[PDB]
Design a protein around this ligand. Structure first.
Ligand SMILES: *[C@@H]1O[C@H](CO)[C@@H](O[C@@H]2O[C@H](CO)[C@@H](O[C@@H]3O[C@H](CO)[C@@H](O[C@@H]4O[C@H](CO)[C@@H](O[C@H]5O[C@H](CO)[C@@H](O[C@@H]6O[C@H](CO)[C@@H](O)[C@H](O)[C@@H]6O)[C@H](O)[C@@H]5O)[C@H](O)[C@@H]4O)[C@H](O)[C@@H]3O)[C@H](O)[C@H]2NC(C)=O)[C@H](O)[C@H]1NC(C)=O
Ligand SMILES: *[C@@H]1O[C@H](CO)[C@@H](O[C@@H]2O[C@H](CO)[C@@H](O[C@H]3O[C@H](CO[C@H]4O[C@H](CO)[C@@H](O)[C@H](O)[C@@H]4O)[C@@H](O[C@@H]4O[C@H](CO)[C@@H](O)[C@H](O)[C@@H]4O)[C@H](O)[C@@H]3O)[C@H](O)[C@H]2NC(C)=O)[C@H](O)[C@H]1NC(C)=O
Ligand SMILES: *[C@@H]1O[C@H](CO)[C@@H](O[C@@H]2O[C@H](CO)[C@@H](O)[C@H](O)[C@H]2NC(C)=O)[C@H](O)[C@H]1NC(C)=O
Ligand SMILES: C[C@@H]1O[C@@H](O)[C@@H](O)[C@H](O)[C@@H]1O
Ligand SMILES: [Fe+3]
Ligand SMILES: [Zn+2]
Ligand SMILES: [Zn+2]
Length: 341
């Protein structure tokens, strides 16, 4: 069975996958789709095997019978004795980030401001912050809360796409893939950094990874951590060093998913692939590294140390947690089960 078809979202992930495919000697091959939802459909049809998904998409996929297989694990201070593959995941902090210079902007004065989101349906970029805002406003009109947004995946003619820029040539405005300039963790943070939006909904790590010389990308070169503040739910503003006390939620890590009938085979292949191309893999620095793509988080987040086994062989609901699962269900009432395709 020993060949896995990975699903790449957009042309840049396709290019990375092709390299991985070459280096793996066709042990992995590539299918490509324009959106994550389209990739999920390829997996269901059996035309692709697997892809790595943010928590919000794991919810979509899980309702259609796809299962979590292995999880992204990043570096941590705690649980250091265990190998990365066997270490429990910790989850990431969803934060709301503003410019320090934008004084007196707090959680409570976000209405009618300009927002930057990773993509519709994603954990930190959409589900957590819009879930909170629906609950707080008692209204399903989340599309009228911000004056203008970039929320890749919304209607390109709506105000939710008004701030998105598209590609080099201005094509593909608001597509939920990396062709969109302001897509993803990095894109949404860039939307703030360039003062297109007033607030970005990303995760803690994104801020650290794109400031104080960590990035070297032309837009991120001169970004200083101190020029940013986190918005806390209590109306306060804190330095980005204080994320542990000023986040919107903790999110389940991104995770590889597959059709249940393929899970065991995808898992075995991926474990061998990471021994070759993972963090201290045989072939990484030298030939190819799975978990690098110049800050662009292609296929996997660049800060991934390894893919970890799950343990408790969880269902998608157990993986996401009852906490997160009810948040999503409640928000989804604005836009009670089956598969959405
Ligand atoms: C928000 O997002 C940020 C970006 O992701 C993130 O910051 C990142 O944090 C991680 C750590 O969680 C950093 O990675 C680490 O950096 C260090 C320093 O450059 C690296 O160097 C050493 O690594 C060692 C091995 O892990 C580490 O030992 C660790 O374990 C020991 C226990 O044996 C313990 O040390 C203790 O220290 C005590 C005080 O003196 C001492 O008395 C005691 O005896 C004990 O030895 C620590 O737990 C320690 O972690 C060494 O201490 C060194 O640190 C290390 O390899 C790893 O790369 C990232 O650099 C950092 N990213 C960036 C870009 O800044 C934030 O944490 C996120 N914030 C939140 C709230 O989640
Ligand atoms: C937007 O606002 C909505 C509406 O409030 C909100 O949805 C609500 O979230 C609550 C919090 O997540 C849900 O309550 C949940 O917890 C209760 C309590 O049980 C838990 O706490 C105890 C005590 O610490 C723990 O020991 C325990 O392990 C639980 O974690 C649950 O109630 C129980 O349900 C079981 C069913 O298995 C019963 O047998 C029990 O008797 C008891 O009633 C509950 O099931 C939840 O898990 C609350 O349900 C939910 N409300 C609705 C209408 O869905 C969203 O979370 C808000 N969104 C955002 C983004 O914040
Ligand atoms: C492609 O997959 C095959 C199947 O796992 C790999 O061939 C095995 O490689 C291991 C480690 O080198 C050997 O010990 C096995 O005996 C090989 N045969 C098997 C199990 O079929 C091969 O390594 C993979 N190639 C790459 C580059 O990933
Ligand atoms: C696998 C994920 O890992 C951590 O993020 C937890 O906070 C989540 O609830 C989930 O279990
Ligand atoms: Fe995410
Ligand atoms: Zn918390
Ligand atoms: Zn279980």
């Amino acid at each position: 069975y020993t060949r896995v078809v990975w699903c790449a979202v957009g042309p840049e992930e396709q290019k990375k996958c092709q390299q991985w495919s070459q280096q793996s000697g066709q042990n992995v091959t590539c299918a490509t789709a324009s959106t994550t939802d389209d990739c999920i459909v390829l997996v269901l049809k059996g035309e692709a095997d697997a892809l790595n998904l943010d928590g919000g998409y794991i919810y979509t996929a899980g309702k259609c019978g796809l299962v979590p297989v292995l999880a992204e694990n990043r570096k941590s201070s705690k649980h250091s004795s265990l190998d990365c593959v066997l270490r429990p995941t910790e989850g990431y902090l969803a934060v709301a980030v503003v410019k320090k210079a934008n004084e007196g902007l707090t959680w409570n004065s976000l209405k009618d401001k300009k927002s930057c989101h990773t993509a519709v349906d994603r954990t930190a970029g959409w589900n957590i912050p819009m879930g909170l805002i629906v609950n707080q406003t008692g209204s399903c009109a989340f599309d009228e809360f911000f004056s203008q947004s970039c929320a890749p995946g919304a209607d390109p003619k709506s105000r939710l796409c008004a701030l998105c820029a598209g590609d080099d040539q201005g094509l593909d405005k608001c597509v939920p893939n990396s062709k969109e300039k302001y897509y993803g963790y990095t894109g949404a943070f860039r939307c703030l950094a360039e003062d297109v939006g007033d607030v970005a909904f990303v995760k803690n790590d994104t801020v650290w990874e794109n400031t104080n010389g960590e990035s070297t990308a032309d837009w991120a070169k001169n970004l200083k951590r101190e020029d940013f503040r986190l918005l806390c739910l209590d109306g306060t503003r804190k330095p980005v060093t204080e994320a542990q006390s000023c986040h919107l939620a903790v999110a389940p890590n991104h995770a590889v998913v597959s059709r249940s009938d393929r899970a065991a085979h995808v898992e075995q292949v991926l474990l061998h692939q990471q021994a070759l191309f993972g963090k201290n893999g045989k072939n990484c620095p030298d030939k190819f590294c799975l978990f690098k793509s110049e800050t662009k988080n292609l296929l996997f987040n660049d800060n991934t140390e390894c893919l970890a086994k799950l343990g408790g062989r969880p269902t998608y609901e157990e993986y996401l947690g009852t906490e997160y699962v009810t948040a999503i269900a409640n928000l989804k009432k604005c836009s009670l089960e089956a598969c959405a395709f």
